[PDB]
Amino acid sequence: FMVSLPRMVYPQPKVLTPCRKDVLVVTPWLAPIVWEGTFNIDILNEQFRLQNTTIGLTVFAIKKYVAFLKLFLETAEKHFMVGHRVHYYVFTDQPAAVPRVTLGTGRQLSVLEVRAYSMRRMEMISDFCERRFLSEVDYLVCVDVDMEFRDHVGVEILTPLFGTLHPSFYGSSREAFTYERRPQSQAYIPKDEGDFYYMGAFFGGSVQEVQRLTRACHQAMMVDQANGIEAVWHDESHLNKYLLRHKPTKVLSPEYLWDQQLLGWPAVLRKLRFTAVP
Amino acid sequence: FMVSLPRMVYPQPKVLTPCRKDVLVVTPWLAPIVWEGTFNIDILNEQFRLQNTTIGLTVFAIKKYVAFLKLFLETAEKHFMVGHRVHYYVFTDQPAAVPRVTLGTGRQLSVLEVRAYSMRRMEMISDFCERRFLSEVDYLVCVDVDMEFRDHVGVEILTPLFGTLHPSFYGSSREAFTYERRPQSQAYIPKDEGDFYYMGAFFGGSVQEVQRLTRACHQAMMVDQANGIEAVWHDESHLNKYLLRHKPTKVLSPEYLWDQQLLGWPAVLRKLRFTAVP
Numbered sequence: 001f002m003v004s005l006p007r008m009v010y011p012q013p014k015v016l017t018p019c020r021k022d023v024l025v026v027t028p029w030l031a032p033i034v035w036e037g038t039f040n041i042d043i044l045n046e047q048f049r050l051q052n053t054t055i056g057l058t059v060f061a062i063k064k065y066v067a068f069l070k071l072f073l074e075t076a077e078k079h080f081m082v083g084h085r086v087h088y089y090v091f092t093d094q095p096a097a098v099p100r101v102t103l104g105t106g107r108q109l110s111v112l113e114v115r116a117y118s119m120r121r122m123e124m125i126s127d128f129c130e131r132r133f134l135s136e137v138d139y140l141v142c143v144d145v146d147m148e149f150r151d152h153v154g155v156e157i158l159t160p161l162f163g164t165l166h167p168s169f170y171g172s173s174r175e176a177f178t179y180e181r182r183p184q185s186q187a188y189i190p191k192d193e194g195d196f197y198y199m200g201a202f203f204g205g206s207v208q209e210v211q212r213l214t215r216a217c218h219q220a221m222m223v224d225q226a227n228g229i230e231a232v233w234h235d236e237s238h239l240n241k242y243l244l245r246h247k248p249t250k251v252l253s254p255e256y257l258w259d260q261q262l263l264g265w266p267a268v269l270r271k272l273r274f275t276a277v278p
Numbered sequence: 279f280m281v282s283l284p285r286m287v288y289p290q291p292k293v294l295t296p297c298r299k300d301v302l303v304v305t306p307w308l309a310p311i312v313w314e315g316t317f318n319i320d321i322l323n324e325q326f327r328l329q330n331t332t333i334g335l336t337v338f339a340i341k342k343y344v345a346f347l348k349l350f351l352e353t354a355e356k357h358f359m360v361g362h363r364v365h366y367y368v369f370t371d372q373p374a375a376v377p378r379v380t381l382g383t384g385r386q387l388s389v390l391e392v393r394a395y396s397m398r399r400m401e402m403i404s405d406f407c408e409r410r411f412l413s414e415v416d417y418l419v420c421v422d423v424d425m426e427f428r429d430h431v432g433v434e435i436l437t438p439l440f441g442t443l444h445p446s447f448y449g450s451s452r453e454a455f456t457y458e459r460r461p462q463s464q465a466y467i468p469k470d471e472g473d474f475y476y477m478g479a480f481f482g483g484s485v486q487e488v489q490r491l492t493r494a495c496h497q498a499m500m501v502d503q504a505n506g507i508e509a510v511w512h513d514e515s516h517l518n519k520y521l522l523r524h525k526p527t528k529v530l531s532p533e534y535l536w537d538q539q540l541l542g543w544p545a546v547l548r549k550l551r552f553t554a555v556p
């Protein structure tokens with residue numbers, strides 16, 4: 001049950017005035033594509049706080065990638081879901097190497113030890129953590145660690161299932177997408193199919209939908225392994241196959257996954273929110 | 279559980295090409311606003327058929343308004359949710375005056391007798407029909423009878439909760455909206471509040487959300503009656519208050535509720551789908 005919003009004073013949306021004319025803001029299956037200028041964060045914050053929303057954030061830091069945790073976590077504290085309940089789940093082979101990061105109120109961090117070695121992340125999110133996540137959070141967000149938050153990443157992303165546009169391909173034709181192209185792989189997508197190329201570095205959704213996605217991708221990767229084939233972009237290839245066949249209910253623009261060193265700062269990006277570390 | 283979509287060949291959505299530049303296609307709370315050119319109906323038909331979606335359509339035809347049923351139903355057969363399961367619920371004081379209309383396969387009509395007399399429709403949808411609707415349909419759509427379908431009205435509208443832009447106000451400033459303006463009414467909205475003016479002639483959603491809306495509006499109307507006040511636009515005033523405080527998850531453009539005699543055919547409307555009868 002969703003309680004009433006309180007009175008709020010904000011600018012009237014005008015039907016004969018788009019908030020962005022330069023970009024596609026809705027997919028052909030009626031999922032919002034999230035860009036700056038498409039959302040009033042005050043309305044969204046109200047809606048999600050009234051539900052006492054808890055967001056889980058999963059991040060893997062294996063072997064040398066533990067070095068990325070300090071900046072990742074410290075910048076998440078500045079920019080990720082501030083004001084909402086957050087539970088970080090840090091999966092690592094080196095629990096002692098996790099930096100001691102000071103957290104804002106209503107935020108917690110759990111260190112989960114895993115083995116060091118493709119299949120780890122999807123299997124770990126689904127098989128091992130299924131019951132924990134269902135009990136502890138409403139939404140799960142799954143991200144790469146070799147990253148930093150530079151600007152707001154908030155409840156505008158939350159939805160039953162989301163992917164993020166890969167920053168190298170958002171302006172590309174589908175034949176150029178680096179989908180798995182061998183018909184022998186479960187991740188196979190023909191040259192005449194595909195909506196978008198989604199990056200494996202940022203996806204999420206409700207716990208139920210994330211468990212469905214990660215289970216399906218893990219199962220598909222196991223089939224590929226049994227058949228002696230490894231998809232071109234590993235779990236990302238499978239994520240793309242899944243999101244082709246199960247359309248996401250929001251798509252995040254490349255504001256949400258950017259590499260300034262490789263791609264600069266195009267006019268079409270009003271904010272660079274979550275960016276690659278060199 | 280949502281099964282995989284089959285392979286489909288369709289045009290690639292291009293992020294740097296909006297499908298409409300002339301109109302707002304998403305609200306500031308990230309609800310799609312449904313216009314022609316924003317959706318691929320083949321994708322949506324697949325998604326909803328894979329769920330074996332059943333749509334209930336409620337319509338009241340009381341006193342002289344029984345005369346509108348023949349055209350309403352015959353044009354609904356041509357244009358409303360064709361290919362999907364439909365259950366019409368015709369509420370009337372004159373069951374014998376309901377025309378015998380031939381229905382396509384997978385479609386059924388129930389005649390529900392009510393008393394003849396504001397409060398009827400909201401109370402009838404909520405209090406009397408609650409259990410029936412939950413058992414029989416997935417979505418409910420609630421419309422005026424003094425109307426005809428001229429073009430496609432399909433699963434693109436379906437969502438947990440939707441309203442439709444009133445055709446007289448979609449280009450208007452909020453101070454001009456005919457909201458209830460007396461603070462003594464439960465439907466009261468101040469001059470500095472409001473997103474849109476929604477028409478009482480076309481709203482809907484999941485059964486659960488429609489029951490919530492109609493219950494809340496019926497309760498609010500009963501409070502008003504006890505306080506000796508009747509909102510300016512009756513149940514529409516209350517519908518507007520409800521949708522201000524509980525944001526709809528889609529908004530239908532005025533393609534979905536038009537009056538050609540009063541308003542002509544503006545360039546911004548590529549289709550006139552559901553229109554007033556003179």
Ligand SMILES: O=c1ccn([C@@H]2O[C@H](COP(=O)(O)OP(=O)(O)C[C@H]3O[C@H](CO)[C@H](O)[C@H](O)[C@H]3O)[C@@H](O)[C@H]2O)c(=O)[nH]1
Pocket residue numbers: 059060061062063064065066143144145146166168199200201233236
């Ligand atoms: O030893 C490890 C190795 C991985 N990891 C974990 O796995 C995540 C993904 O790997 P990586 O970021 O290297 O992929 P990226 O290189 O960012 C993968 C991305 O860039 C590619 C080019 O390098 C392509 O553009 C591809 O499409 C894109 O997904 C990493 O962030 C860590 O959370 C770990 O903890 N220890």
Ligand SMILES: O=c1ccn([C@@H]2O[C@H](COP(=O)(O)OP(=O)(O)C[C@H]3O[C@H](CO)[C@H](O)[C@H](O)[C@H]3O)[C@@H](O)[C@H]2O)c(=O)[nH]1
Pocket residue numbers: 337338339340341342343344421422423424444446477478479511514
């Ligand atoms: O004797 C009756 C009376 C009503 N009804 C039923 O109630 C529905 C609404 O009434 P109506 O269409 O007259 O309102 P409208 O006049 O279309 C109401 C609309 O137009 C107004 C101007 O006339 C304003 O623009 C207002 O904002 C808008 O909602 C009608 O379609 C029938 O299903 C019935 O069965 N028998």
Ligand SMILES: [Mn+2]
Pocket residue numbers: 144145146201
């Ligand atoms: Mn990475």
Ligand SMILES: [Mn+2]
Pocket residue numbers: 422423424479
């Ligand atoms: Mn009417």
